[PDB]
């Protein structure tokens with residue numbers, strides 16, 4: 508039952524070199540996690556806009572990013588989706604890095620687009636000790 512708090516997730520992704528990863532700040536990555544999953548490592552959504560399922564803290568779809576069975580999968584991260592439901596987000600970060608490499612950047616995550624892209628996040632982590 509791993510559920511993160513903003514500042515905890517931040518210190519975490521800040522130690523995985525995410526701050527500025529692909530030109531994206533640390534606040535953006537977190538902001539993304541807050542609205543995609545509410546910082547829940549076990550968050551699940553089985554009726555995505557597509558039709559598959561979104562897994563974990565970053566809600567990685569199973570049609571493009573991880574492998575399952577319900578349907579085929581490019582499984583571009585070469586890892587089973589269930590891994591994204593366990594409490595060590597070490598392997599979810601590695602796959603979220605692959606995602607931002609695609610043409611649409613962090614817009615791959617609709618929630619980040621809805622409540623993060625157009626917002627002023629200069630103080631989003633101000634209360635955090637990093």
Ligand SMILES: [Ca+2]
Pocket residue numbers: 590591592593594595596597598599
């Ligand atoms: Ca994991």
